[PDB]
Design a protein around this ligand. Structure first.
Ligand SMILES: CCCCCCSC[C@H](NC(=O)CC[C@H]([NH3+])C(=O)O)C(=O)NCC(=O)O
Ligand SMILES: CCCCCCSC[C@H](NC(=O)CC[C@H]([NH3+])C(=O)O)C(=O)NCC(=O)O
Lengths: 221, 221
């Protein structure tokens, strides 16, 4: 009997794209925050984590690990995964490009300090020259307010989340991509997303060094 | 209309799981091998690669990039992705664990020499203590010949592929996992997989140093 229950630490990390997708879908959720290695070990010892890792989400009577398993379930359940197999292929292709870029941004702070400047420069180059051109071209191709099927899907949600992180890195990177700018505004004004973006929501801030320190202690790295 | 066409270099890399899945499904396909940077640049210049990367597969009148988009499409098309949303969530959880382990093995040879021994040691620990226990537990929980739904799915195929790679790493690692051993035998005896395992199929050999140098020249890393 439950709202979905999100098991993670109090940070974006690997859970934030799930927070975004549930919120976009209008689904209220609860979070159980891991604060210590001891908390993680309890989840493990109680049999809740198939591969001894989080994210884990309790939803519809079961316990799901692996970010993509969680996301795929939520997207299908709430009709955000397209209408057929071909639309799912477009969605998947798009969101896996988003994932590749998002992964780079997620792990930047765990890069060795002597590698960070080059890694950041590489991310900016890929945004400007690979990823933003590819999504701009999709929107330019059909002229529709959404990426796939002329209707909101998880692709729109995952992309606009990523546009917010790119803005935190360098607000100028989107400047030559007017359709991406317009998508960002449109998605951000949908009632459910607007509510998620407002202060006090479950949306999480950029990870600071204190949070990274907590991650290292919880996940033992 | 036409057979799927697989665009990659002549190696396992990120295309081999697609070769296994198609073969297991009984689907004949064609390969177009990239042999140099110039071949890759032609695919790029011709507009065929959304993110300027391969794998790319031409299937059912469309070009798909991103390994998971390709695999998801093929699995759905050939009824290897479960029967409903809950079975897909089990499949996705399982295969993303498999992916995590597979990725560690795939990238081992591009780890700096100074760190390879320690990375290999940690991969073997995770196999023995994390991943093989998790899959053995699944098979023991229901006593069924397949991981999900008592019928062949992509999870069985992706797992057994990985079991072949683990065998190449260290043939002792599976020894305390009799149900995984049994699964490897049963799946290997399915007519389509048996054929794929025999000589002269599209199955690719382990990547040797000369093939890794070719990857470096093609992909410019
Ligand atoms: C820079 C931010 C990093 C913050 C921590 C990373 S997420 C926590 C980590 N989980 C994973 O790595 C899960 C990977 C998995 N592929 C998924 O996406 O769910 C964990 O439980 N690690 C414990 C373990 O593997 O033992
Ligand atoms: C031991 C080395 C392993 C060799 C595997 C390299 S795969 C080739 C590489 N493609 C990718 O990285 C694709 C990643 C994508 N997430 C997917 O899974 O399809 C590429 O085109 N790279 C060119 C580029 O990104 O510019």
């Amino acid at each position: 009997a439950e709202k979905p229950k999100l098991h993670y630490f109090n940070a974006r990390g690997r859970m934030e794209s799930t927070r975004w997708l549930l919120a976009a879908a209008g689904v209220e959720f609860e979070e159980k925050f891991i604060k210590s290695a001891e908390d993680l070990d309890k989840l493990r010892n109680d049999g809740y984590l198939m591969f001894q890792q989080v994210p884990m989400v309790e939803i519809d009577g079961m316990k799901l690990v692996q970010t993509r398993a969680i996301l795929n379930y939520i997207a299908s359940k709430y009709n955000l995964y397209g209408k057929d197999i071909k639309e799912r292929a477009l969605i998947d292709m798009y969101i896996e490009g988003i994932a590749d870029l998002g992964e780079m941004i997620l792990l930047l702070p765990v890069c060795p300090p002597e590698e960070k400047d080059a890694k950041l420069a590489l991310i900016k180059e890929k945004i400007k020259n690979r990823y933003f051109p590819a999504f701009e071209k999709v929107l330019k191709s059909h002229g529709q307010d959404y990426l796939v099927g002329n209707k909101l899907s998880r692709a729109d949600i995952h992309l606009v989340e990523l546009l917010y992180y790119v803005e935190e890195l360098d607000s100028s990177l989107i400047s030559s991509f007017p359709l991406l700018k317009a998508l960002k505004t449109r998605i951000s004004n949908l009632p459910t997303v607007k509510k998620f973006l407002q202060p006090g929501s479950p949306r999480k801030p950029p990870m600071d060094e204190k949070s990274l320190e907590e991650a290292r202690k919880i996940f033992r790295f």
